[PDB]
Curated annotation (Swiss-Prot), chain A:
Changing L44R: Increased resistance to neutralizing antibodies. Decreases HLA binding to NF9 epitope. Increased binding affinity to human ACE2. Changing L44R: In strain: Delta/B.1.617.2, Epsilon/B.1.427/B.1.429, Kappa/B.1.617.1, Lambda/C.37, 19B/501Y, Omicron/BA.4, Omicron/BA.5, Omicron/BQ.1.1; Contributes to cellular immunity evasion and increases infectivity. It comes from the Viruses. Binds to host ACE2. RBD also interacts with the N-linked glycan on 'Asn-90' of ACE2. Cleavage of S generates a polybasic C-terminal sequence on S1 that binds to host Neuropilin-1 (NRP1) and Neuropilin-2 (NRP2) receptors. Interacts with host integrin alpha-5/beta-1 (ITGA5:ITGB1) and with ACE2 in complex with integrin alpha-5/beta-1 (ITGA5:ITGB1). May interact via cytoplasmic c-terminus with M protein. May interact (via N-terminus) with host bilirubin and biliverdin, thereby preventing antibody binding to the SARS-CoV-2 spike NTD via an allosteric mechanism. The gene is S. Residues 40-48 are annotated as: Immunodominant HLA epitope recognized by the CD8+. This is Spike protein S1. The chain holds residues 409 to 457 of 1273 of the full protein. Attaches the virion to the cell membrane by interacting with host receptor, initiating the infection. The major receptor is host ACE2. When S2/S2' has been cleaved, binding to the receptor triggers direct fusion at the cell membrane. When S2/S2' has not been cleaved, binding to the receptor results in internalization of the virus by endocytosis using host TFRC and GRM2 and leading to fusion of the virion membrane with the host endosomal membrane. Alternatively, may use NRP1/NRP2 and integrin as entry receptors.
UniProtKB/Swiss-Prot annotation, chain B:
The lineage of its organism: Viruses, Riboviria, Orthornavirae, Pisuviricota, Pisoniviricetes. Residues 3-47 form a coiled coil. This is Spike protein S2'. Subunit of the fusion protein that is processed upon entry into the host cell. Mediates fusion of the virion and cellular membranes by functioning as a class I viral fusion protein. Contains a viral fusion peptide that is unmasked after S2 cleavage. This cleavage can occur at the cell membrane by host TMPRSS2 or during endocytosis by host CSTL. In either case, this triggers an extensive and irreversible conformational change that leads to fusion of the viral envelope with the cellular cytoplasmic membrane, releasing viral genomic RNA into the host cell cytoplasm. The chain holds residues 947 to 995 of 1273 of the full protein.
Amino acid sequence: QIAPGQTGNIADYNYKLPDDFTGCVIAWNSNKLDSKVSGNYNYLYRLFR
Amino acid sequence: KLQDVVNHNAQALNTLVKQLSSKFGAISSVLNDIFSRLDPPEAEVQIDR
């Protein structure tokens, strides 16, 4: 969903890239330090702006 | 010839104004639809065409 110019809840409400963006994107899942049996609720997001 | 010159000029102007409606194999023939109905990164090619 996150991309230069793409619309969405994160784009409209969180870190949004500009139309003319140059760089590289790296993605990977790290359950080593993010998996909590009770829930790793500290990773928060905003959905009302 | 006096009629011919004026007729040629009128025909040239009419052709020039008529060729505006051509889409040139693009999404639409007006700028607002291109700018509002598509992502700008992939609308740049259409507007440039």
